């Protein structure tokens, strides 16, 4: 429906594509072992929220500071620094 304003605020499209995995989950009928396709869609969202957190991490390995994570700069990038995104722990 749009994206330029949901990029400045993409953080909101993760707390809601979870509430839409839960209302999809209410209709997953995945209480018994027989349900499966519906436990495959809960994993497809888990993969995307995950590789989205992988991307925030590797873009914090591509630093520019010659003191903050010297690797990836003028120093060897064969050893990355702390694989944290330096996120501040949003509530």
């Amino acid at each position: 429906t749009a994206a330029d304003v949901y990029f400045r605020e993409v953080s909101q499209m993760e707390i809601i594509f979870e509430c839409l995995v839960d209302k999809e989950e209410a209709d997953l009928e995945s209480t018994s072992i027989d349900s499966v396709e519906w436990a495959n869609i809960v994993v497809n969202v888990n993969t995307i929220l995950k590789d989205m957190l992988h991307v925030a991490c590797q873009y914090r390995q591509s630093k520019n500071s010659l003191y903050k994570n010297e690797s990836g700069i003028q120093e060897p990038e064969h050893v990355p620094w702390t694989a944290s995104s330096g996120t501040a722990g949003i509530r």
């Binding site: 590797q58 390995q61 060897p76 990038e77 064969h78 050893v79 990355p80």
Partner: protein, 183 residues
């Protein structure tokens, strides 16, 4: 430097042009004993490099020297690396060998710090440039094969950390290798 040079040159030259000419080696026995001792010496020297490569990885200058030697190699026209040449070759294989990167041992980081072919961007560029040259070796197949092994290495290095620029160069290299019918 010294090691290889010595072994090879000495052995071959001397024998072929002094002992295969003058035959100081005399008895069908003495000639053989002398020949065996010379061949043993060549083999022991080649093994020394091999035994080393199996342990120590090779530095930038020593690896380039080994590549420089292998560029001139004749596999005997007979079509078989003699006990010596085969060994030199497997030695180089182990030098290049990156198989230790696939063994899930808790010592991966320590072993990575010890492998000279690990922390020098210039190492990969130099070898890649040499193997990409259409100056093949004395033996186009040589250029084709090492190229392919370096390429499988490049292929994995994406997984380790994030080294995936050279992944592209693997398909053309593999094609060149296959075109040299490395098989």
């Amino acid at each position: 430097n010294k090691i290889l040079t010595l072994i090879s040159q000495i052995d071959v030259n001397n024998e072929f042009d002094k002992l295969k000419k003058e035959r100081g080696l005399g008895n069908k026995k003495h000639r053989k004993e002398v020949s065996d001792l010379i061949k043993e010496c060549q083999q022991s020297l080649a093994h020394s490099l091999y035994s080393w490569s199996c342990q120590t990885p090779l530095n930038r200058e020593d690896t380039l020297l080994l590549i420089g030697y292998l560029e001139k190699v004749t596999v005997e026209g007979d079509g078989s690396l003699d006990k010596v040449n085969l060994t030199l070759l497997m030695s180089l294989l182990y030098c290049l060998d990156v198989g230790f990167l696939e063994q899930g041992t808790d010592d991966r980081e320590e072993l990575m710090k010890q492998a000279s072919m690990f922390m020098d961007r210039q190492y990969i560029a130099a070898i890649h440039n040499r193997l990409q040259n259409t100056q093949p070796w004395k033996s186009p197949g040589m250029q084709a094969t090492v190229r392919l092994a370096w390429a499988l290495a490049l292929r994995g290095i994406s997984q380790f950390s994030e080294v995936l620029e050279f992944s592209e160069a693997d398909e053309p290299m593999a094609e060149i290798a296959i075109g040299g019918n490395v098989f």
